């Protein structure tokens, strides 16, 4: 397994170099927003990002080591968390706003135009503010985003008893080693290293929460025929089960 033999510094380089591009929305400023048109812009954007996410996942060390069935499951579990952590990262330098794309920077009042969205917008804004106060570094961000990919679906590998996916866990341990290496090299004390590692990982629980609320919100928009979803988005949504 290549991944396992990477050094910290090599782990960081692969992840940094695998980063996807920042895409643009189809925002058209000649027109006012509706619930329907806002949902349209956001899902059109998500849909295009997914194609880049799949390519990025393939470049996360150890990911290509799994069966297609396993890769499919992980991305199905993590895709919205991953779009969200990316969004909150892009938004860090824009206190009060969410940078969905460079041409689509929205404040919570604009989020109100979609029924049930503002509550999630508020959680996203708060997460961005938390990253800003913690002074999250890009090297640390890429590590968390990979941990999300490898972790979120891991305890749903049911055979229905949990399969031992030591490979994934071995990779997750390497990313832990890398986060710690980055913090040490950043000058943090031993106690500060474990404290920060904890603060960063606890945020992932909040990102999971936001993902579950956004998935429910997206399912609601579909069941109200607010926006046509791409077949990919329909399949990713369907992976989660909502009623």
């Amino acid at each position: 397994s290549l991944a396992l033999s990477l050094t910290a510094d090599q782990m960081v380089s692969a992840l940094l170099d695998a980063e996807p591009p920042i895409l643009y929305s189809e925002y058209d400023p000649t027109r006012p927003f509706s619930e329907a048109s806002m949902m349209g812009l956001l899902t059109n954007l998500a849909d295009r990002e997914l194609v880049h996410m799949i390519n990025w996942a393939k470049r996360v060390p150890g990911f290509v080591d799994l069966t297609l069935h396993d890769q499919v499951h992980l991305l199905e579990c993590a895709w919205l968390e991953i779009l969200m952590i990316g969004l909150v990262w892009r938004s860090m330098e824009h206190p009060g706003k969410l940078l969905f794309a460079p041409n689509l920077l929205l404040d919570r009042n604009q989020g109100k135009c979609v029924e049930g969205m503002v509550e999630i917008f508020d959680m996203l804004l708060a997460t961005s503010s938390r990253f800003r106060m913690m002074n999250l570094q890009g090297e640390e961000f890429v590590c968390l985003k990979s941990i999300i990919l490898l972790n979120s679906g891991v305890y749903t590998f049911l055979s229905k008893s949990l399969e031992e996916k030591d490979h994934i866990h071995r990779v997750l341990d390497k990313i832990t080693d890398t986060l710690i290496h980055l913090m040490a090299k950043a000058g943090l004390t031993l106690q500060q290293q474990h404290q920060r590692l904890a603060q960063l990982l606890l945020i992932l629980s909040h990102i999971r929460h936001m993902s579950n609320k956004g998935m429910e919100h997206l399912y609601s928009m579909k069941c109200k025929n607010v926006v046509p979803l791409s077949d990919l988005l329909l399949e990713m949504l369907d992976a989660h089960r909502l009623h």
Binding site: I54, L68, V72, E235
Partner: peptide, 9 residues
């Protein structure tokens, strides 16, 4: 399944 296809390409 679309994802399955995209993961091969």
């Amino acid at each position: 399944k679309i994802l399955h296809r995209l993961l091969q390409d």
